[model samples]
Target: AQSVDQLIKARGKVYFGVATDQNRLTTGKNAAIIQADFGMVWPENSMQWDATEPSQGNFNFAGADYLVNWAQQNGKLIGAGCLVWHSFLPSWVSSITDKNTLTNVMKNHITTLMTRYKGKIRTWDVVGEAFNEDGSLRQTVFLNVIGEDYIPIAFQTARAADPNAKLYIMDYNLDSASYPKTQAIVNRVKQWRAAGVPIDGIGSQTHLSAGQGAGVLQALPLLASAGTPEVSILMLDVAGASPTDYVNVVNACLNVQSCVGITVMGVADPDSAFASTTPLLFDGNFNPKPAYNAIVQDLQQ
Candidate 1:
């Protein structure tokens, strides 16, 4: 198993993947490496609301289409990154003080995208980064206008659009279960479940600096225990990390039963969303680095 994805799946059911966007998909050797080694892809920005429907009724699928098309052509699983997030959300959708109007807009966005892509997407981040650093809900427009039920609104809307796609709520700062944010996430998921909401998974954006893989090893078990059958460690970036750091993170997932997948932030060091950080498995030249080999060897075993 020369490819990481091949060796990863060969070991078990988990997916080894990367974050991909239109920019990376249409670039240098990064795309080639992605097609070869990664089994799954998380669309970084193209699938977000800003990229999909920037001007209310006007929809733009050019960027998103390129990513989904490339993923399908390469036989990779696609994670339709996000439908609702306060940051990338355009102005029109956010300024609505009326709950019903905001609700209608959100439903339209989720249903349209989910219905458009349908089976091509394996998972959908229905809502993203909805919590603050203190583990309390962020005061985003969705929560402010629609109240706590907005979380359920997004998930249920997504499920109605595509029953087969795994609906996930994604957030950062969840790499360690000891964080109050992580505990809050687990508790929130339970509340949603008790209400019979159709939530399926949670995503931990394991963005870290060097030597922090220990926290990842500490986090997944409790995250998986959060009542969802699937948990994905996403948007990983380890600044100045060594080969050992890479393997430690990979092994963390291999050892967790409910941790079904992991995805790095991007394909190459140059393209890392975290600028000035050497966190990717590949350098800018697309050469596989020591960290790449380390993960491959770990997966092979």
Candidate 2:
């Protein structure tokens, strides 16, 4: 049988990936299937700010390290989920009122994570969810303290820390087509690129409802025109949908040249962040859903 990864590779473009947690990857019954089927992996939660550094100066890598090491041992590409986000923030970060102190904190966080995984991470979502639906900057602690300059500083710090890794600014609501939020992010990315920031990609966390592929398809040209080298559907969730729904989303991405890959939010139903919804390609029993087969068939085409 042709694996999903093999079929995608046969097309000579785009990768097919799934998000995974350390618990699932290390001991779930579906681990072998994940290793066999996908060419790329995104550390679902392990690489997030709260997970890696919940305290001021202390750092923990036990979970992320396991996933990273597994990907390396198995020759899978790693897409580190994020280096910075307003949510999932440690308490120490929220308490800071001093601009300089927050700046140093941001730099230290990015530098430490990127430096540790430097050459190993294929891409880094350097900053996540920086804008609101109205295209205004979200008033996060980072923005409130460090100002809009923080975005550039974070990206620059990431570049210096991992020169080889592709860096991205990621956000949600982009799958809505020409929604203002989508355009807002695209515009911001374009502005950053024009100013010579080293952002290599824009990530759309395509957390969609069923039958929304057309909206995402409609949004493609606008997103592509932003001139980033790559655009990825970093997290896709069409909950309560069928395999056909999955195929529709994948086909939308395949039709766009700049959209380079599709990563389902989780490996299986139970592993999903929305476990009750069963939004992934596999069932709780680790059996491939029609969604999983549909992707393989689409790639084969």
Candidate 3:
């Protein structure tokens, strides 16, 4: 059981998440982190462009800021919500009618939001999903207006605003070694590093299903080889409809030191409800299930 013990210990310090209603973050029997004394909480929608700034020239911090302040006051770490530049933007901004205006809007939002959270925010997902599996630009808003350099610009801006925080460029398709898009992002990170850019890390959202970890592990070296910077498994949800799938992901994380951490949700069932299935260690009744216990054992191992 040493492997199990080591796994448990390794993941013991990791974050446990519960994608509950914004207000339920601190209270609610459905919270895994609150029960386990896990020191971190990640907001799902607060930091997104649409949630943060639903209207041009108008911002909404009401939802996200609550999590931030709650975490700070309770001595818990806070991971800002999905900062995807495209999906998160308000309809007005997302549906920009003019090219130049769209570019200006992106620059303004990226620069302003990051600066405001400068010192308070310890970590950020600076640029997300800028490319596809074939290493081609996703033709996202930023790429269309600002070009490939938009990635480095986002990091640089984040760094300049908050010199103390760690900057991360994250993506979802990084689970495959042969994926062109994964390779493309890795190459981009290297290019940025070579240029003396301010990028500090790469975030692989390990939303694995089944048997995907091996491929992701194979790409770990290539991604890590980019530079001496650290790599974090930003998010790992079983996504599959079975507990075995979740365990496989945990085992995968256990095998990779480059995989610094994992996050789980508690509010929803594992196999159903894409939006509400909170896969945290704790169950709906706030009780620890075998899978949750298995995760604890894996982390301790």
Candidate 4:
């Protein structure tokens, strides 16, 4: 709820949070954090189809393996990264015309990755951004090839491969009140549960613009009430505003026990006029800015 470092220390309403990128983790000078996030596990960058499976039957695990090892050594919980529809597929894999082969390729990808991180990854973004803001399936490669069933299929596959792991659906803007798309997201999650899918969480990728209207705080209650089984909110890329703004958001999160935690994007200058036009906590050279430093001051009250 505060910034990542403070949130971890405060054990705030949302204790766990995700980083915006690998650079954020590396730059933080806190690599040994016992409860830090899972490292980046991108298949596209880590395992291009050419590199991972140059020949149809062969496979590679170099990239994914590095992430697993990093988490293991650091004593951090390895929440699996971006297996949501987009980043999981290698470029070459998308070229396959045979529907069955594509399906097998996807299945293999999930099985192999999940198998390696099975017990280690307690939570997973099993299916990411499968639905549009309106709650309809998007025109993604997965949907194009595997049909709408890919959402449930991916969840089922993850559950089958790692029955102990919790399944999550990650997306952005769905928490905003202005869009029906967010509502659609709730409907989809409800459908999944009603149909007997083992969905355990939702990852709200909060990339907010300072001047942009805040997402519907009301939507938090709607999402929290969406499923039969409880759902956790994985607040990803959540940093962007002064201590005052964060207090409002944090309070909303606290009200919803479903809010797992807020991940603070590292302090940066307000890139807009409506915002404070200053560092959130630290200045350009990383000096402690007043509003930025006041986060702890504010929270102390």
Q: Against the hidden true structure, what lDDT does model 2 obtain?
A: 0.83
* Poorest lDDT segment (10 consecutive residues) of candidate 1: 1-10
Predicted candidate 3 versus true structure: per-residue lDDT over 184-265, tens digit per residue? 8878788879888887777777666555655755666566666736666655665432456556665655566555455553
Error of 3 at 205 (Å): 1.7
> What is candidate 3's CA lDDT for residue 210?
50
- By TM-score rank, best first, the candidates go 1, 2, 3, 4
> Could you give me the TM-score of model 1 versus the true structure?
0.96
The C-alpha lDDT values of all candidates are 0.85, 0.83, 0.62, 0.57
Model 3 spans with C-alpha error above 4 angstroms:
1-21, 35-37, 97-103, 240-244, 265-267, 270-280
Clashing pairs in 2: 243-291
lDDT of 1 by residue, 1-301 (tens): 2688888788785678888887777678878788788899888888889888989889999888888888888888988767988989898888899989999998999899999998778888889999998899999999999998999988998888889999899998887768899899999898888889988998888888788888788888888888897888888778875788788888888888777888888888888767587888888777888888888878877
Clashing residue pairs in all predictions, respectively, total 0, 1, 28, 5
**RMSD of candidate 1 to the true fold?**
1.3
- Arranged by lDDT with the best first, the candidates are 1, 2, 3, 4
Candidate 1 displacement at residue 291 in angstroms: 0.9
